[PDB]
Design an enzyme around this catalytic site. Structure first.
Site, PDB file in Angstrom:
ATOM      1  N   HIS A 299      45.703  26.659  36.256  1.00 38.63           N
ATOM      2  CA  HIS A 299      45.989  26.948  37.655  1.00 38.63           C
ATOM      3  C   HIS A 299      45.660  25.790  38.592  1.00 38.63           C
ATOM      4  CE1 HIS A 299      41.670  28.043  38.450  1.00 38.63           C
ATOM      5  NE2 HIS A 299      42.012  27.500  39.605  1.00 38.63           N
TER       6      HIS A 299
ATOM      7  N   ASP B 275      44.904  30.905  31.295  1.00 36.16           N
ATOM      8  CA  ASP B 275      44.492  29.926  32.294  1.00 36.16           C
ATOM      9  C   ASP B 275      43.770  28.728  31.676  1.00 36.16           C
ATOM     10  OD1 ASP B 275      44.102  28.569  34.574  1.00 36.16           O
ATOM     11  OD2 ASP B 275      42.678  29.964  35.477  1.00 36.16           O
TER      12      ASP B 275
ATOM     13  N   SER C 134      36.638  25.453  39.604  1.00 31.56           N
ATOM     14  CA  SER C 134      37.769  25.842  38.755  1.00 31.56           C
ATOM     15  C   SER C 134      38.123  24.719  37.792  1.00 31.56           C
ATOM     16  CB  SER C 134      38.985  26.158  39.634  1.00 31.56           C
ATOM     17  OG  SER C 134      38.944  27.505  40.037  1.00 31.56           O
ATOM     18  N   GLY C 135      38.414  25.065  36.541  1.00 32.81           N
ATOM     19  CA  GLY C 135      38.709  24.044  35.546  1.00 32.81           C
ATOM     20  C   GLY C 135      37.469  23.542  34.840  1.00 32.81           C
TER      21      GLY C 135
END
Ligand SMILES: CO[C@H]1CN(CC(=O)Nc2ccc(-n3ccccc3=O)cc2F)C[C@@H]1NC(=O)c1ccc(Cl)s1
Ligand SMILES: [Ca+2]
Ligand code: NA
Lengths: 52, 233
Positions: free
Chosen positions: B42, B88, B185-186
């Site tokens: 994402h 994801d 995120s990630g």
């Protein structure tokens, strides 16, 4: 033995294989002669903090 | 990261930071080897052009050891969709190999069955990033790390306004004000086993950050071990 008891005494991966425990290691480590310990093959093996 | 602490030197060496055109970090990643970075699928929609910083713990002040690496190939899970946030996960191949060094080194990929029965059954994991330090606050210039309890799937489903899939897990606290946040995120979620840290999660999503009765939602890496493998060869 069993992997659910002190991880079969392995430093890393444990699997049950014919009523006995077989240890293994991630890439960048080689399984010790004792069949339990993982010995890194270089200075920055994966998953080790860089403290030294 | 809301709550938690700055990583001490060498504590979080597998942390990669994705930086947009404006040289600003917007997502994290995890170093897997000299050529590959694990991150969230994402993240690839939140910038077209980005690079990968490693060895950083303080964005405002530049130190001895940081490095920027261009992205060669983007390998995004073919089943990710913003609609569901399922699948994801993405892998990146860099143009130039990382040189491992202080604050720069890979996290280990576990064997799946052992990870399921041994890492995911631990009390807690570790998440890390330069993300916001409160839901409506700024990103941190210091790399932060935070211990998060594994949270039971059923409890997580109940707490959630969005479908949690088998490719997700939840971690964090019901009301305690500690969590990951925008910018993490990630990034890495790792679990320690006898002094070695193994990739278990990818910071994926949450409704706000550290909200009361909401947890952090992470991509379940054990579902994707073969996928990451194929992606790296
Ligand atoms: C203020 O920072 C917050 C704001 N959030 C914006 C956001 O869109 N979050 C969501 C992302 C994805 C989803 N989601 C999940 C399933 C199906 C559809 C769907 O949309 C919901 C969000 F609220 C994301 C960001 N929070 C986080 O990134 C995290 C918090 C804890 C973790 Cl772990 S990541
Ligand atoms: Ca710096
Ligand atoms: Na919460």
């Amino acid at each position: 033995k069993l992997c659910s008891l002190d991880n079969g005494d392995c430093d890393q991966f444990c699997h049950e294989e014919q009523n006995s425990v077989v240890c293994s290691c991630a890439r960048g480590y080689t399984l010790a002669d004792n069949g339990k310990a993982c010995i890194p093959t270089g200075p920055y093996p994966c998953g080790k903090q860089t403290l030294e | 990261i809301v709550g938690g602490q700055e990583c001490k030197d060498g504590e979080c060496p597998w942390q990669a930071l994705l930086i947009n055109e404006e040289n600003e970090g917007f997502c994290g990643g995890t170093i897997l080897s000299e050529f590959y970075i694990l991150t969230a699928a994402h993240c690839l929609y939140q910038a077209k052009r980005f690079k990968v910083r490693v060895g950083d713990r303080n964005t405002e002040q530049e130190e001895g050891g940081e490095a920027v690496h261009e992205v060669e190939v983007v390998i995004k899970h073919n089943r990710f969709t913003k609609e569901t946030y399922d699948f994801d996960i993405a892998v990146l191949r860099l143009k130039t190999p990382i040189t491992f060094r202080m604050n720069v080194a890979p996290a280990c990929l576990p064997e799946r069955d052992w990870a399921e029965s041994t890492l995911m059954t631990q009390k807690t994991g570790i998440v890390s990033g330069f993300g916001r330090t409160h839901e409506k606050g700024e990103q941190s210039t210091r790399l932060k790390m935070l211990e998060v309890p594994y949270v039971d799937r059923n409890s997580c489903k109940l707490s959630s306004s969005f479908i949690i899939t088998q490719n997700m897990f939840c971690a964090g606290y019901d009301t305690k004000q500690e969590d990951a946040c925008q910018g993490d995120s990630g990034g890495p979620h790792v679990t320690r086993f006898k002094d070695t840290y193994f990739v278990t999660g990818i910071v994926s999503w949450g409704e706000g950050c550290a909200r009361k009765g909401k947890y952090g939602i992470y991509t379940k890496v054990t579902a994707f071990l073969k996928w990451i493998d194929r992606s790296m060869k």
